[PDB]
Ligand binder design. Structure first.
Ligand SMILES: Cc1ncc(COP(=O)(O)O)c(/C=N/[C@@H](CO)C(=O)O)c1O
Ligand SMILES: Cc1ncc(COP(=O)(O)O)c(/C=N/[C@@H](CO)C(=O)O)c1O
Ligand SMILES: [Cl-]
Ligand SMILES: [Cl-]
Ligand SMILES: [Cl-]
Ligand SMILES: [Cl-]
Ligand SMILES: [Cl-]
Ligand SMILES: [Cl-]
Ligand SMILES: [Cl-]
Ligand SMILES: [Cl-]
Ligand SMILES: [Cl-]
Ligand SMILES: [Cl-]
Ligand SMILES: [Cl-]
Ligand SMILES: [Cl-]
Ligand SMILES: [Cl-]
Ligand SMILES: [Cl-]
Ligand SMILES: [Cl-]
Ligand SMILES: [Cl-]
Ligand code: NA
Ligand code: NA
Ligand code: NA
Ligand code: NA
Lengths: 395, 255, 395, 255
């Protein structure tokens, strides 16, 4: 028995060992309670405003659309404290942890942004934070590992399996199964077992709510489409949620195409994977023909979650949202273009969303369209990667 | 078939607990795994619990994580595991054979088709490690349609609702991971559950006798057998010798 | 003849070659005009809000003041686009450039933050940007150099003199003397010849204006003191300006003490230098006994300007503002403390201001005081430096 | 003293322009600098303009930036430069000696004291490169109190107000950096300015004759002498030979 529906159509559920079910049920009850509690909402609002810096700007980008009939806005989650959208929902989940009387936080991270967000929230709110991270990721994300450590979090390398995000995901669930009486599992995306896809959406939905109010103020109408990258699904469902019932507004999610879908070296399970059951949910997976879970490949470290949130799989199945992919090279071009023409260095994750908006514009330059791209993070973290590529090419 | 029913009837007549070792199929290779399993049986295993290597065993601790890595290093696949199961059953007609599976491997090519293959090779039960009773309906239904017992874990944080559900839904045995222990065991009996096997930290003879004394039908060694494999990789012969010594001692404790 | 007073008491002036006087006079006239122009003010406001992300948060920091009678707020210029306060006044100066019909920007930078701000503003507003940077600084600020280049700016290494900030300052003035008909010199601090100290203050004064409104809203009274680091003086005068006439409010500027004032390896000319004439102004200088200009030493790359803005020298002389110093070790402690206890990674420049507030608290823990520290920037840029120190110490 | 007045009177009588080389004191060392300066004089320099090495010569291009670096490499200080000036004057009683200074070196130990030291060593003029007429009052006053001519630059972007101010404030000569050239020169005369020397890009004899033809009293070579030093560092003897050849040719062009 649950209070809320664990499924989005056929997708989602609570596919965990029996021992973890009480932890999920406890968390769902706490969330449902919190959502009706004006005191909780006020505390969350206070942290978002006065600590994280909400509301974030909605920036009109005039240079990049010159000579076309596209108007493009960027929702500036890159300006949130920590440098990405991840901060919003960690502050909400840290408050849920406290509501439940927990004093410890467990988190998984791949690229390190969710780990940093979890560590900063834990430091502010007096929680002891431990972060699982695949050993291969630890090795390639020394800067983020160091930020996490400066903020007092324990970073635990995971050597099992592929030593990447999925393996860190498993380790976090293993820990929580034993520790849930005192520890909360701060899952970093809109995926995993119920109630996480629901909680993460509700604690990211201010992205779309603010976007709607901002675009109404500036343009007097809703956007033709809102566009967001999809790794596990949090920034995209945060932008989409408040527009779901506005049926004229397109919802476009962009998965990483990597070296190209046809190479198989990508991270686009929603459109090019196969439904499976893993990490507590039934959803599209990167997996072998015989059902072993595989990694997502992308230039962008943050689009590495090898599945996708079940609400995205559902919105796609009913035709409410459309999902596309953007290759490494397309994302890199978009990165360069925004730096040079708007003076904003975007995360390479977010660059996938921008690349698709640029394609919408360039393909049909005399189509009148009002687009919003969710700029999920800043790209300071990516300048070394980009530097190394441009050198290798001979640029 | 009725392999668990027949086993428990026979043990009950002998006033004896079951001892059930777990191993990962194909660890440390197919040939050696087949030999390990025959050694467990010859040494007095009453039933087997057998894992199929999976990329993401999120219910398993380090010992079994490493067994999976060894099996993968040997190139072991689920298809090869099913070939192994058919050969094991062909050699040993009465011993109950249970699988410990992850949901994705069951769902991958169709849940019904998975349980049909289990039936074809002579498997008796399947425990799906990441399917709680709340999500179990299609798995239990397919199991029962193909004469396979669906096995459920009764965890240390179980409540009365869960006890009733496990008692209703499970067959073969109840996997006890242990409310006081005496409470759980009596309540499972009260609710006519499949006989309980204690599965928590069973690594010594004393724990087998203790499980039986508490009113359980026997004990499952979830990782101790795998630890012996790990420790003896360099000496296949010594590995089999220690496995035999261990299983013999654990079985002796069930009397 | 000028429209505005070029001096703050004895400090300031226009000590440039005669050839540059028309450029300064032109800029002063354009500024005076712009300040009366509602269209200019609206364009500036639009960029600050919708591009840079103003207003910035005022964050109450509860953990670090626990067990004392200090209440400490941080003004969050670290959340501005670009990661420091430098962005505010570059947007204003880029608009002045356009007002004057200039299509090119020249800027100097030491640590690279002003260079990045100049480059981003130039990219957004369609100006061709060239940045002078001492060769030694270029070598040690490869990340910032690369951001500047990604944003389409030309970065020109300066090999003359000490190959540091002062030499880049000279080169920018040399270029401008020849190019001022088409190029604007985007000076990065509240120093140099009139009208720059005035313009930079007026284009940074929203820091203090917002702080005042925010503290009135949250506490119902003015702060006891506002505290800011002083390299050349921009972030500090931006925080101070709106409080100057509120005589109860302390104005505390913090210069870098380096290895300690007594070592002579510091950057605290206002309190420990000697008045001289250089870079277009009469002000306290780091200089030899016979009048050669010297470098400022600090852990923090950004507190390297070897003089100080003339309005600071004036406010000190009349006793309106007080200036103190904080050593490398004190700044590093403050950096660590804010990361661990508030989950905010501060610039090492800003860490000097925080260190002095922590000293005010710790020295007199039963003194009731309401303090604001200007957090001039984020400290992502500093994590390698900090990492290297902690390793060397054995931490 | 009246060294510029006497020089211009003598040149006017000979229908001759002045040729004035610039060099940095102590470049490439004190001894060689003294020899360079004596060579310039022997070769026909009418007056000297002499720089004191400064850390931040923000009015100078690369040639002079590098001369300063060479002098600093030799350990040259302002005090040593003033010792040099006294020795130069002691050898050469009538030649006008002008300094090109940065404001900080003048202000450092007191503006009045700086001009008093200038008077003691026999300097005739000081041009402070980063002091515009607008800021010049304390410098001009101290100069005149110590019998030193304050020299001002009339730049290419000069206006009538500036022409009037320079004409009023300057003494010795006006430093012309060149409104049309004919306009500036006639207007300076109209306003009774100190005689104009053309200082922009004077690197060839033809430019000296051109300056005189335009109505200027002569020409200042702002960097050409320093370039010859730069090019001949490895050969002190060849350096002096080229310096002599160059100055002789430039002076010949003033007739
Ligand atoms: C800046 C940014 N944009 C988008 C995403 C994509 O995540 P959603 O789809 O929005 O949930 C990420 C993810 N990062 C994770 C995984 O490595 C992490 O940091 O641990 C990100 O850092
Ligand atoms: C984050 C930060 N805080 C404070 C200061 C100090 O400058 P004011 O005193 O506020 O003008 C700086 C300076 N940086 C200059 C010089 O290297 C630059 O980037 O070019 C800074 O980057
Ligand atoms: Cl409470
Ligand atoms: Cl640390
Ligand atoms: Cl509303
Ligand atoms: Cl409108
Ligand atoms: Cl699919
Ligand atoms: Cl048998
Ligand atoms: Cl199912
Ligand atoms: Cl007994
Ligand atoms: Cl206009
Ligand atoms: Cl580039
Ligand atoms: Cl007001
Ligand atoms: Cl109040
Ligand atoms: Cl002083
Ligand atoms: Cl003489
Ligand atoms: Cl003065
Ligand atoms: Cl002639
Ligand atoms: Na357009
Ligand atoms: Na994904
Ligand atoms: Na307090
Ligand atoms: Na300074």
């Amino acid at each position: 028995t649950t209070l809320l529906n664990p499924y989005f159509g056929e997708f989602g559920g609570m596919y965990v060992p029996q021992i973890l079910m009480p932890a999920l049920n406890q968390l769902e009850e706490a969330f449902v309670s919190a959502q009706k509690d004006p005191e909780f909402q006020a505390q969350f609002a206070d942290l978002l405003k006065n600590y994280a810096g909400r509301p974030t700007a909605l920036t009109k980008c005039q240079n990049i659309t010159a000579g076309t009939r596209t108007t493009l806005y960027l929702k500036r989650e890159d300006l949130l404290h920590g440098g990405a959208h991840k901060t919003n929902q960690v502050l909400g989940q840290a408050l849920l942890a406290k509501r439940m009387g927990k004093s410890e936080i467990i988190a998984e991270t791949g690229a390190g942004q969710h780990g940093v967000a979890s560590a900063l929230a834990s430091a502010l709110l007096g929680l002891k934070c431990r972060i699982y991270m695949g050993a291969k990721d630890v090795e390639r994300q020394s800067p983020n590992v160091f930020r996490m450590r400066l903020m007092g979090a324990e970073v635990i390398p995971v050597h099992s399996g592929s030593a990447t995000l999925k393996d860190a995901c498993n380790e976090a669930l293993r820990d929580w199964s034993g520790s849930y009486e005192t520890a909360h599992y701060m899952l970093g995306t809109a995926a995993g077992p119920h109630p996480y896809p629901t909680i993460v959406r509700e604690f990211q939905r201010m992205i779309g709510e603010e976007t709607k109010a901002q675009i109404l103020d500036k343009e007097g109408r809703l956007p033709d489409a809102v566009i967001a990258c999809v790794g596990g699904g949090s920034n995209a469902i945060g932008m989409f949620a408040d527009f779901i019932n506005d049926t004229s507004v397109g919802l476009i999610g962009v998965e990483p195409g990597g070296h190209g879908i046809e190479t198989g070296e990508h991270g686009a399970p929603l459109k090019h994977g196969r439904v499976g059951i893993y990490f507590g949910m039934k959803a599209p997976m990167m997996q072998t023909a015989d059902g072993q879970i595989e990694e997502s490949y992308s230039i962008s470290a943050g689009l590495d979650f090898p599945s996708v949130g079940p609400q995205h799989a559902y919105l796609n199945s009913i035709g409410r949202a459309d999902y596309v992919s953007i290759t490494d090279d397309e994302a890199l071009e978009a990165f360069k273009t925004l730096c040079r023409h708007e003076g904003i260095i975007p995360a390479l994750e977010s660059s996938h969303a921008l690349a698709h908006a640029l394609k919408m514009m360039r393909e049909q330059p005399e189509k009148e369209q009002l687009l919003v791209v969710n700029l999920s993070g800043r790209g300071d973290k990516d300048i070394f990667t980009v530097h190394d590529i441009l050198k290798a090419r001979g640029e | 078939m009725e392999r668990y029913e027949n086993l428990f009837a026979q043990l009950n007549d002998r006033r004896e607990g079951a001892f059930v070792p777990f191993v990962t199929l194909g660890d440390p290779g197919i040939e050696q795994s087949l030999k390990i399993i025959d050694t467990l049986i010859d040494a007095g295993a009453d039933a087997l619990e057998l894992g199929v290597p999976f990329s993401d065993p999120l219910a398993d601790g380090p010992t079994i994580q490493n067994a999976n890595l060894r099996a993968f290093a040997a190139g072991v696949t689920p298809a090869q595991c099913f070939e192994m199961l058919a050969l094991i059953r062909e050699k040993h007609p009465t011993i109950p054979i249970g699988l410990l599976m992850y949901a994705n491997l069951v769902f991958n090519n169709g849940i019904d088709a998975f349980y049909a293959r289990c039936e074809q090779v002579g498997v008796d039960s399947v425990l799906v490690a990441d399917v709680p009773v709340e999500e179990s309906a299609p798995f239990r239904q397919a199991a029962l349609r193909h004469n396979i017992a669906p096995i459920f874990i009764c965890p240390p944080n179980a409540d009365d609702d869960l006890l009733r559900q496990v008692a209703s839904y499970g067959r073969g045995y109840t996997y006890l991971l242990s409310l006081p222990l005496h409470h759980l065991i009596e309540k499972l009996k009260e609710y006519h559950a499949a006989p309980a096997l204690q599965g928590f930290g069973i690594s010594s003879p004393e724990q087998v006798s203790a499980a039986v004394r508490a009113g359980a039908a026997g004990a499952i060694s979830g990782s101790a057998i795998v630890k012996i494999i790990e420790k003896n990789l360099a000496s296949p012969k010594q590995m089999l010798a220690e496995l035999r010594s261990f299983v013999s001692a654990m079985k002796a404790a069930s009397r």
